[PDB]
């Protein structure tokens, strides 16, 4: 007689969750962003073993409020300025809640036609917003495109499955007896490409000796130099190796550098190498015409991925992978075989609800107002000669630091490094900011990632005042 | 001025979503389990392009109700009898909703301490319910766990760790020796395991699918696995990894975990146990013998999103040595560095998976266990098994049918017997009578049944346990099977 989905529990448990969410957003700014807990704190709060008997849902919610929430890093805080913000929206949450309750597994079209078609629809809609060519689309207005997409869990998964497909294609182009020729395949990316990409290369079985990290410098604002890429790919070809795959990044994690997509595709075309564009974060911006030039040349790459669960108001997980001309690998399906796992949840519903409820114009203004807030912060930094902006700001991420010579406590470039680390730790201890760092050209650098969903312009200005106040009392 | 998380919208959108969920559960039994739509219907109804302007959320919900629901296969229906049911609960739905709204990204402990510490706690609690050997749990232990999205990812990361250890110790020159590694699983192993082998770079010629037969109830014969591994070693290949399944997808065969581990230990091969479905039953003492020998395997995975009332995605991976996983999966990018990670006192769970980012999936799993407790979880397993037993004994009492294999859990395999009537004189005729019984059951909309092949024969699966499903739904399904069968005969 125990019914886990009985009508009363479903309504009252979900109403309590909704109440908690409302209160959480209303009060999250009043909490320290970074929690003041040490490793292991939780097992000293909660029971060591699962309970034998049931408890009222109120007990569970009270432990969430008393023991979970205080040990969280509040990504949702308007004062979260770290990594890339996980932007979100009421429609996305609603869509993921409905997907959880229907709880379908879409491993074939027949296993739920609406879920498969909605994911294809969501992908084709976003592709239009990005102005991707018809070669990346499943359905068009009146017919079929020549491409396809799939909604993956992470950008890493997108890299893996396109690495695997390029790997198997190059193994057969080079007359390999199964994987016997795998030790001749080489792969390439700038040194600013995410480290998870080189990990994906090793997971796919590429040889560590043949995984190339191409050095970048400040003379290209740390974007990949196509001449350096050609030099490396030509040297491998002349040495008997097979250039198999190049990853170009639009909007690197560290400093938001941009690889020149068209020029990278031209260089790789000399060797028939697969080209994948990783635009996990900055891809979202490319739904706006003034950012779409960053994807010029996408029509000549093999695949492209971006993550709505960063900068397009869709909660995790939601990474969109697009593949050109899928014939090289009436029915309506996504690229189901280009995932790690056959059967996972219905991720397309929330992406569609975001697009259907808010529309293109509001998504575009969401991007533009984040960029404008980032420009406000950048111009404030540029107005204080104790600081420097270390690279041009391309999107909504600013990299800045206390420069050497800003005070006696920042006399050398190594003293500036420790001053910037000290500033970051002091900001985080206030609870009114979460700032994290990177290293750019050998220098310790603070990142400032604008765009947390509750964040407004006055939050960014207030963070800048706090940075100024903290720096000033550091220089005594 | 556009604020997607404003308080008014957050409250009313979610209240409309809850009202929809309430209606859905109350009405889903009355819908046909399988939809009646053609491929491509959706973009016809919604449009080919996204809208430029905004719309009230009520319109989004109306398009959900009018265009999406009529095209769904209703996994939540009490009359869904295919694959394995995706059991769910109010607590798991509530946990996932809360996790979606907080929307933290727990790649490191520091990125959100509670997200990682509750996942560890939830894994430890489940390990206790399963009575896993303490070597799988975590101050000198090396065992530990990770929640992943899928069994496929769990197979992938353990295959990669096994591969890297085999290449290292067998003197491979980089990956030049990768074509010498071999892996083994019974032919009843889920096809995603063979796909994960191909993803990791194993040679298709070296991926061994061991035949099984009725002699072992289609479980892996350990003598035949030893034969296959010894032959490969004698030929200069390196036996690298063995996958044992407890509760196979097709007929719920169970591999002998202890004996398989003992065979593979002659070659120092990695042993992984896939208990995706049936692992949840092992929280009950009368089923826990199916995991005997697990103390000698390297890894085991199981999915609460099948039979433990936790909505997708939720798959738990346990290993006896996390260092063998993090050795292959860890990264150390500068922008992620923090003092807690440097101290060695935490495991950043990005180092236990393919990706960097990850949802707070521990919350829903902890909420299920915390709210319902072990005894209710146990009774949930037992009462599904008793419903399957009811259906199995009903099949056994009708001479026109056979139960094709012994029933270990809550899946019954059964068949219109050969020689049951005129439309099933020969076995080739039975194969077509069963395909027509299946397709007719599905056309009524009061059932969804899908088939399998057991020993060359067309077999219907009857997978009991959809969360809304009660015993009278199973008895009524049997009555519908008899009725359709009699009409077929004349
Ligand atoms: C966020 C980020 C990633 C992280 O990838 P996941 O596997 O989805 O966590 C990869 N690439 C870039 C450019 C990123 O900004
Ligand atoms: C259902 C099933 C699977 C499916 O794995 P996923 O990748 O999570 O879809 C794997 N193994 C077994 C035994 C199963 O029954
Ligand atoms: N390199 C970490 C930044 C990151 C990684 N994975 C993510 C998912 C979502 C998000 O907002 C940031 C992020
Ligand atoms: Ca048409
Ligand atoms: Ca904003
Ligand atoms: Ca470490
Ligand atoms: Ca039940």
UniProtKB/Swiss-Prot annotation, chain B:
Effect recorded for residue 190 to A/F/Q: Reduces enzymatic activity 50-fold
InterPro entries: Aromatic_deC (IPR010977), PyrdxlP-dep_de-COase (IPR002129), PyrdxlP-dep_Trfase (IPR015424), PyrdxlP-dep_Trfase_major (IPR015421), PyrdxlP-dep_Trfase_small (IPR015422), Pyridoxal-P_BS (IPR021115)
N6-(pyridoxal phosphate)lysine modifications at: 306
Keyword tags: Decarboxylase, Lyase, Pyridoxal phosphate, Serotonin biosynthesis
Single GO biological process annotation from the record: serotonin biosynthetic process from tryptophan
Entry keyword annotation includes NADP: no
Oxidoreductase recorded as keyword: no
Cofactors demanded by this protein: pyridoxal 5'-phosphate
E.C. designation(s): 4.1.1.28
Domain of life: Eukaryota
Impact reported for residue 335 to Q: Reduces enzymatic activity 20-fold
Outcome following mutation: residue 337 to A: No effect on enzymatic activity
One Pfam family recorded for the sequence: Pyridoxal_deC
Residues at which serotonin binds: 84, 190
Induction conditions: Induced by senescence and abscisic acid (ABA).
The protein's enzyme class: lyase
Active site per UniProt: 335
One of the record's GO cellular component terms: cytoplasm
GO molecular-function term, one example from the UniProt record: pyridoxal phosphate binding
Role summary: Involved in serotonin biosynthesis. Catalyzes the decarboxylation of L-tryptophan to produce tryptamine, which is converted to serotonin by tryptamine 5-hydroxylase. May play a major role in serotonin biosynthesis during senescence. Accumulation of serotonin attenuates leaf senescence. Catalyzes the decarboxylation of 5-hydroxy-L-tryptophan to produce serotonin.
Protein family membership: Belongs to the group II decarboxylase family.
Listed name of the protein: Tryptophan decarboxylase 1
Organism: Oryza sativa subsp. japonica
């Amino acid at each position: 007689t125990f019914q886990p989905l009985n009508a009363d529990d479903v309504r009252s448990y979900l109403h309590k969750a909704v109440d908690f969410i409302s209160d959480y957003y209303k009060s999250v700014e009043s909490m320290p962003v970074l929690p003041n807990v040490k490793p292991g704190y939780l097992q000293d709060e909660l029971r060591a073993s699962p309970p034998t008997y049931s408890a009222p849902f109120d007990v569970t919610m009270k432990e969430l409020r008393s023991s979970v929430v205080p040990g969280m890093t509040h990504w949702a805080s308007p004062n979260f300025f770290a990594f890339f913000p996980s932007t979100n929206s009421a429609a996305a949450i609603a869509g993921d809640l409905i997907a959880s309750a229907m709880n379908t597994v879409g491993f074939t079209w027949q296993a739920s036609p609406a879920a498969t078609e909605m994911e294809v629809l969501a992908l084709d809609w976003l592709a239009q917003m990005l102005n991707l060519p018809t070669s990346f689309m499943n359905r068009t207005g009146e017919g079929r495109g020549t491409g396809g997409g799939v909604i993956l869990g992470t950008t890493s998964e997108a890299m893996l499955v396109t690495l695997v497909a390029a790997r198997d294609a190059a193994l057969r182009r080079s007359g390999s007896d199964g994987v016997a020729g795998l030790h001749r395949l080489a792969v390439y990316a700038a040194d600013q490409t995410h480290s998870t990409f080189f990990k994906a290369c090793r997971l796919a079985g590429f040889d560590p000796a043949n995984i190339r990290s191409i050095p970048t410098g400040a003379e290209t604002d740390y974007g990949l130099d196509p001449a350096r890429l050609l030099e490396a790919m030509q040297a491998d070809a002349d040495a008997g190796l097979v250039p198999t795959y190049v990853c170009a990044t639009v909007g690197t994690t560290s400093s938001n550098a941009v690889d020149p997509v068209g020029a990278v595709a031209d260089v790789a075309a000399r060797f028939a190498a697969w080209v994948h564009v990783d635009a996990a974060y900055a891809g979202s911006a490319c739904i706006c015409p003034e950012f779409r030039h960053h994807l010029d040349g996408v029509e000549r790459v093999d695949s492209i991925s971006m993550s709505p669960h960063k900068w397009l108001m869709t909660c995790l997980d939601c990474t969109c992978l697009y593949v050109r001309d899928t014939h090289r690998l009436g029915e309506v399906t996504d690229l189901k075989d280009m995932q790690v796992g056959v059967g996972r949840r219905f991720r397309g519903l929330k992406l569609w609800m975001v697009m259907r409820t808010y529309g293109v114009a509001k998504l575009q203004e969401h991007i533009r107002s984040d960029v404008a807030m980032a420009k406000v912060f950048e111009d404030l930094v540029r107005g204080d000669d104790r600081f420097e902006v270390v690279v041009p700001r391309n999107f909504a991420l600013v990299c800045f630091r206390i420069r050497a010579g800003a005070g006696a406590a920042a006399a050398t470039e190594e003293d500036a490094d420790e001053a910037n680390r000290e500033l970051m730790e002091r900001l985080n201890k206030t609870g009114k900011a979460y700032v994290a760092h990177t290293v750019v050209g050998g220098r310790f650098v603070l990142r400032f990632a604008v765009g947390s969903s509750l964040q407004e312009e006055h939050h960014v200005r207030s963070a800048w005042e706090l940075i100024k106040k903290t720096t000033t009392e550091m220089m005594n």
